[PDB]
Design a protein around this ligand. Sequence first.
Ligand code: HEC
Ligand code: HEC
Ligand code: HEC
Ligand code: HEM
Ligand code: HEM
Ligand SMILES: [Ca+2]
Ligand SMILES: [Ca+2]
Ligand SMILES: [Cu+2]
Lengths: 197, 303, 466
Amino acid sequence: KLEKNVGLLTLFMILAVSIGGLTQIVPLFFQDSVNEPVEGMKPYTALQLEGRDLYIREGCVGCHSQMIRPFRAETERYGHYSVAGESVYDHPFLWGSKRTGPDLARVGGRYSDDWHRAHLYNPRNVVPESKMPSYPWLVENTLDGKDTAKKMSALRMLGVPYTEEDIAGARDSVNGKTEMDAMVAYLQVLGTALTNK
Amino acid sequence: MSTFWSGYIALLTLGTIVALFWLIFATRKGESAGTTDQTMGHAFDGIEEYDNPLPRWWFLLFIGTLVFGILYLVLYPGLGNWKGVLPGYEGGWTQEKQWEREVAQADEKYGPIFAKYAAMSVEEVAQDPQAVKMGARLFANYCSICHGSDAKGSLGFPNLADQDWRWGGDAASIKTSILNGRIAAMPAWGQAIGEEGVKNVAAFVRKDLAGLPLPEGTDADLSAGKNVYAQTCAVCHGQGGEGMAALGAPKLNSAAGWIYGSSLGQLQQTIRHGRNGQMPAQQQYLGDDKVHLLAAYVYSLSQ
Amino acid sequence: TSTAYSYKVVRQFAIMTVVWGIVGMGLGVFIAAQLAWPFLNFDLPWTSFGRLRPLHTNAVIFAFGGCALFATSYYSVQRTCQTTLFAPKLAAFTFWGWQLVILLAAISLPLGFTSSKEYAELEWPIDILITIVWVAYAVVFFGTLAKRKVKHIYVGNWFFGAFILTVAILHVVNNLEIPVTAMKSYSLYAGATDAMVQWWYGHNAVGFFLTAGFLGIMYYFVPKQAERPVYSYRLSIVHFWALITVYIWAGPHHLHYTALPDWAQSLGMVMSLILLAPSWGGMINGMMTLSGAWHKLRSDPILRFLVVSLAFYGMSTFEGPMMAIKTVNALSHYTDWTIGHVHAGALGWVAMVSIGALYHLVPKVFGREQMHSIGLINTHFWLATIGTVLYIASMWVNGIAQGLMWRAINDDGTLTYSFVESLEASHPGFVVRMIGGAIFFAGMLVMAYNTWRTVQAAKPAEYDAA
Ligand code: HEC
Ligand code: HEC
Ligand code: HEC
Ligand code: HEM
Ligand code: HEM
Ligand SMILES: [Ca+2]
Ligand SMILES: [Ca+2]
Ligand SMILES: [Cu+2]
């Protein structure tokens, strides 16, 4: 009856509840298609990586997906449907769950740096009916590159093939650059890996 | 997927399904036909509970979902490496294969249309109302965010609706702009020309070339401006300010087509620090077909 | 001696449930307004939408929902098995422990320290703290069970029990991360694998924290308020085990038509659909319990909450399975529809059930025979319902509009609408939702006022022994 048995209930619960986790997550660790990077794809550069972490801190994900679904209309609107290999070095993944603003999986080189700067500084200013927050502080802030070294080391440890060359002087790739510089660098790499392999 | 993980999944999946069927039938044992009543032994605070049966419909709904689960897992990928048995899809269904088909079918439908316009010259497409409607629709999707939804631009971004073209406004020029992109390079004259130098050409360009009036008491040396302009500016912008479409040097004898403002101060900034307009190339994002239509659309705008 | 229930902790968590409810839902209203009128972002990093959002999220789930669960389980478990909470001090820790967690969330998230992982956004030092508080809570709860009086353990505690263990596993697994600095870590996983770990966690967060945990609430409060027996014991068994096992599999319904492999996606849909059954076994058991006593609904607004609570629960555990069908998700995903589903479940089920539960327990725990004003429980009820319905309605309109507009192709194959056109279409919806939430929020203020008025009542509270 297991309802007078406190540990027996506990055990069968921890058992019952585990099956789906073991059957869905575990085999993906070992699946090739979701761990292979796309053809020529490199890890994010010091600056890109620093900007990706800026994208993360600002909550951009909360309005922007990075995951193009394999429908014709999504394809037409954004480009090639996203591929498992593209996000293989994304700790943590930034596929969306909402599109308050458009998908950014392939903002690629679709817009100029200059546009990106204007638009982040005040989206309403270039896209009058935008609901995006203004991000002017990105311009007033300067990366010092203190932690870039650590971040790459951490990520290499997690599988991302950063070179010793990469870690050495990841600091001076970044030092003095503005947060906005980094955000733009990041945005300009999104989805480029697939379309130039 | 290796064949181990393939089975690993199928077994645990079907094992859970078998488990659930067992659960559902096991507890449905000495079932009391209908709503019955009576209680059971032992209470909790006050809460007690009826030994009532599982509702007939709810039972069936449970079996419905489980049966369908099998039906679907047979038809579709899910049970490990088990490519689907779904008819119509060769080698089994994947989200990729479904997309391949979807686009492929679109090409059989919308192909002839694109083909039809691709055979015509840009200007021929432009006088075809249908094509322009399509150009307009393409434009709204891929261009409106920079060049405005009205195509009339904003600061930094050319108005494509007017009669002023920086890179030329013949079809071929317009197509090239869109197809290959365009980067302009107005170099910076600040250091080269001096701050007073900047102030003077700016005033010269504003008053004498563009025919705009100068703000009150701004003592600029227009003669200097004139000379500075002839010495340096004229090479790209033509002396007289007729512009040079080869370089994307815009005409300066009219503020009409200027994308960086026309105030003395703004001119000063353009002149002092340069400009580098970029029109991103669409050859890669949109392909020759879409681009052709877009060129026709933009061409149409000005007539 | 000590044979008098430990009501101290329950009292704290109850009050704090109402407080976080207000703070959380306020934030909700606020960011809702930002989506309508972006000037409310205020060009400040700490008050912009991207950073505030996960604050609403964490405030509302872990702070509001969290405290509700603590207040509810600590009250429910003690009585449902008739002994004082095991280690009353360790339970006190789990109060301040939890409060410290929420306070850290409040400071850390607008400051920009987020893992980005949905519903797991807090950085590693806080995840350590959470685990510690949770382990402590697990010991307090399971300990109270382990020293009960009755041979049988009430089915309400099966749900609580499950929720506790499974949230613990979930939390630890999905927050494995290399720390880089004090407040920055990288996820152990990446890409598709990270996505799966995330939504295994993500769904089972609401699966167990917001469903299982709250069904525990439902199982105590519906019968206790209604004063009827629980229609079908057997249903409790099936509905419990089936739910507890099938729900874990529902991860992939988040990642439909994404880079997650096809097989996983399907496994998610198939089990999401199976899940409809066990889910409804919840609402069947809750509602059929009220059969005969339906006349109490015009009489007792506390019961109204609980019942209407199940109505929305039922609806959203139907809507969910539907949206977990690939073809449906094909429209639903990324749109405001998801947000609607969320708030139907969130306002309609989680909020309503816990409201009701608090309204029941708050007087009891404050040595008081009932709430200050029953009329204000009713007026709360209407605000809360009108509010929920508006929100749902506006999100369906918006979500269909978006889904439709995004994929709308013309007769010549070109895309019919710009993304900005879809954005614009959504503005009316954004405003109705803001009002819908506002109205809901107003009801929470009515609750606060009510609760406070009843808390003045007596001061040597503590009326509950055998
Ligand atoms: C923002 C990244 C833009 C995108 C998106 C589009 N255009 Fe553009 N375009 C942009 C700029 C800043 C400029 C000026 C560049 C310069 O010389 O400084 C342009 C220019 C054009 C032109 C040339 C106009 C002329 O005067 O000759 C054309 C014909 C043009 N752009 C067309 C066009 C189309 C069809 C687009 C959508 C596919 C499009 N542009 C997008 C900026 C941006
Ligand atoms: C919620 C409101 C947000 C926040 C949190 C972010 N963005 Fe966006 N964004 C939003 C909307 C409604 C739009 C469409 C209108 C417009 O273009 O301004 C956008 C747009 C973008 C774009 C352009 C995408 C495109 O047209 O291809 C980019 C590149 C973009 N946003 C970036 C971005 C960044 C880096 C953010 C964090 C600072 C960010 N957004 C947040 C709505 C919202
Ligand atoms: C060679 C290349 C030159 C030189 C020697 C000058 N100009 Fe400039 N200019 C050039 C280009 C290709 C452009 C377009 C820039 C862009 O679209 O990004 C410009 C632009 C200007 C403008 C702005 C027109 C507008 O507002 O849209 C002005 C005011 C201008 N140029 C003036 C100017 C002056 C005063 C010069 C001599 C000091 C001068 N240019 C030289 C290309 C070139
Ligand atoms: C009471 C008034 C509320 C309002 C006005 C409100 C508003 C919002 C808004 C505006 C968003 C962001 C929507 C978007 O990006 O489109 C959101 C997200 C969310 N809210 Fe609320 N909320 C309220 C209450 C609640 C409550 C009580 C809960 C309890 C669980 C809750 C749970 C959530 C969740 C889980 C999300 C994230 C949705 C997602 O990631 O898809 N909300 N809310
Ligand atoms: C039968 C049980 C349920 C199923 C199968 C289900 C299914 C789903 C589906 C298909 C989505 C959309 C995923 C996407 O398109 O991004 C979703 C989103 C969501 N649902 Fe449920 N739902 C169920 C019950 C509930 C309930 C009762 C709640 C209330 C707490 C809830 C809370 C949420 C939240 C918070 C999200 C959004 C997470 C995100 O940000 O992506 N779900 N659900
Ligand atoms: Ca979401
Ligand atoms: Ca976390
Ligand atoms: Cu889910």
